[PDB]
Amino acid sequence: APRKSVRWCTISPAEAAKCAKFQRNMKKVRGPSVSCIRKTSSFECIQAIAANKADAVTLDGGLVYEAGLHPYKLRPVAAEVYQTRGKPQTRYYAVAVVKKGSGFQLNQLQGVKSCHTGLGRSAGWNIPIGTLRPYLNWTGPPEPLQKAVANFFSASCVPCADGKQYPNLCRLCAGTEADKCACSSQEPYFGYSGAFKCLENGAGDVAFVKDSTVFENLPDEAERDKYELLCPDNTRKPVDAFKECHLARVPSHAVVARSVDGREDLIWKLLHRAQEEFGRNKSSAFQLFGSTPGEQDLLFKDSALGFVRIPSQIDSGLYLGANYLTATQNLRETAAEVAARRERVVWCAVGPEEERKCKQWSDVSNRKVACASASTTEECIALVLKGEADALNLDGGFIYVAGKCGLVPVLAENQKSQNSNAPDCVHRPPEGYLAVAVVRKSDADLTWNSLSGKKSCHTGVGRTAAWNIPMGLLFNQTGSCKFDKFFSQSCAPGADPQSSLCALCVGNNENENKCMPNSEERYYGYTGAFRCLAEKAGDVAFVKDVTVLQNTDGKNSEPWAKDLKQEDFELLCLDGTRKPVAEAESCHLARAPNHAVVSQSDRAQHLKKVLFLQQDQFGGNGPDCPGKFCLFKSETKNLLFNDNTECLAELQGKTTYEQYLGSEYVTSITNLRRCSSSPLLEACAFLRA
């Protein structure tokens, strides 16, 4: 039964004496004992870890990208949480340390000495070179970026550098014969604390190190004052100024096991007791961080406060918070590839259902647009976060998620509503929308309070229309965090398949794949949940009045209901009542925010333009939509946008969702997280700390 004690991979005789030293105290307090084994470098250790002659090790943001790289796909076990000199974070900033007097402003860097933390590490490599890119004069990857660096710097100390290939980069790395620049602390100017020394020592002219490394290495503000910083403003700034003068602020390092059969718990087991009874004035007898100055920075980072178990769907890219993985992937492309990307907008189409629409669109866009869809909106969103994708028109409630993750509204799903029309849609006041509980006409008595334990129709969970608004009320009036027993059983897209509220749900034409978030479920969208009441099955549905009209007296043509008179249904008023379809501007549930294309702010603004142009290349406004393509026009299916959507328009300054959606809804939609929530919102709650 003894779960196999873990095996940490060490890249040096010290990383081992260290695991050894730790080992002692493990059986000494008798917690989850380990067994470390050696593999020369971080990359070398990764292999043992995955091909399990080992299991887990700690590595820098950069290396994760690698750790999670296809050849070996490993999972970000637990990142180091560092002191923040504010509130303890994982995301470290990136700056380059410079000797005041050397004065060579970033740009003015051509051909001096460069000290590095290693080949491939965050601020130690991936980050610097990338910004030093433009200047470098490198065709692209076919010509290894590797040579442009030396060709750029008269000298460099880059651990794990392919020295015999072009000498120049190990030129600055002191060392044994072997160990000179051998990727491990068997080389001084390595990692943070190592590379740092490099500088002070003369041969070291500039390095880019942890926004602390100096502080790490300097307990004398007079000796600290001995330094200055290199900033993207090209000018130099103070040390502690790493907050306002620096390159990229990447997420820390982390422990990582195989994305497969991690032992993750076993792992966390260790880290926990370790963080419980050593370091932090916990074990005056032993500690794991404050370690040696002779072989500085070890297994993790010295003084790296604590850590956090990364919850589970996170994979390489995911943990890497788009922006940085962008930088890294970009490190292996051509301005061609690059350029192209930056304007050829990636879109995620909620399912194969939308996947083809975009495909179509990918074709008429004159290759301006291109997509990879994802299962459910969540995954789509997530995807954008992963960075493979760029956008999707999100539903209010859905957008909520985006924001909590850091996504900002770009253009809103404008109603095409009538009033005093003109291209002014482009920027028109959002008429929001009116969700309403349209009840089936005939059945009159089934009024408000009375709903008690019925069959119900939903556009989805976590969505405006039907979910959010309705659900909240009920619970407000029933505390049913275990909702079900209010609505005997319904059909809503996304709940527990084996939910006691899905059932009603039907799969594709071939009746398979029921109770899920995507239109390829005859009941998903404002649309299908209408199909639900009409299918005389679910005895009550809420959504916006608009959807009704969308599919009444011929407004729509699918055989199933093309027939139903708009007079076939009543609309359930709050005050007991059940008003007419049309007249819900009294009767409705309430008015809520429309949808809107949301994005990673840093891509978004550029999108805004392309959409503005693109939409007029289609739209229930322009001329070509009538012709060879319609965006905000579906086929009533309402993919990406609604066929009734005039143009995606300008927000009213409402950049954050907290803005767009707004306090009340904003707040209430979290009350709901209470009862149950998604791993994704969890993940966001966890990364965007």
Curated annotation (Swiss-Prot):
Compartment(s) of residence: Secreted; Cytoplasmic granule
Principal EC category: hydrolase
Keyword Metal-binding: yes
Binding site for D-glucose: P430, N594, Y660
Annotated residues for binding of hydrogencarbonate 2: T459, R463, A465, A466
MF terms (GO), sorted A to Z: metal ion binding; serine-type peptidase activity
The organism's place on the tree of life at top rank: Eukaryota
Keywords, ordered alphabetically: Disulfide bond, Glycoprotein, Hydrolase, Immunity, Ion transport, Iron, Iron transport, Metal-binding, Osteogenesis, Protease, Repeat, Secreted, Serine protease, Signal, Transport
GO biological process, one term: iron ion transport
Residues involved in Fe(3+) 1 binding: D60, Y92, Y192, H253
PTM field: Poly-N-acetyllactosaminic carbohydrate moiety seems to be needed for TLR4 activation.
Residues reported to bind Fe(3+) 2: D395, Y433, Y526, H595
Its biological purpose: Transferrins are iron binding transport proteins which can bind two Fe(3+) ions in association with the binding of an anion, usually bicarbonate. Lactoferricin binds to the bacterial surface and is crucial for the bactericidal functions. Has some antiviral activity against papillomavirus infection. N-terminal region shows strong antifungal activity against C.albicans. Contains two BBXB heparin-binding consensus sequences that appear to form the predominate functional GAG-binding site.
Protein name: Lactotransferrin
Organism (species): Equus caballus (Horse)
The encoding gene: LTF
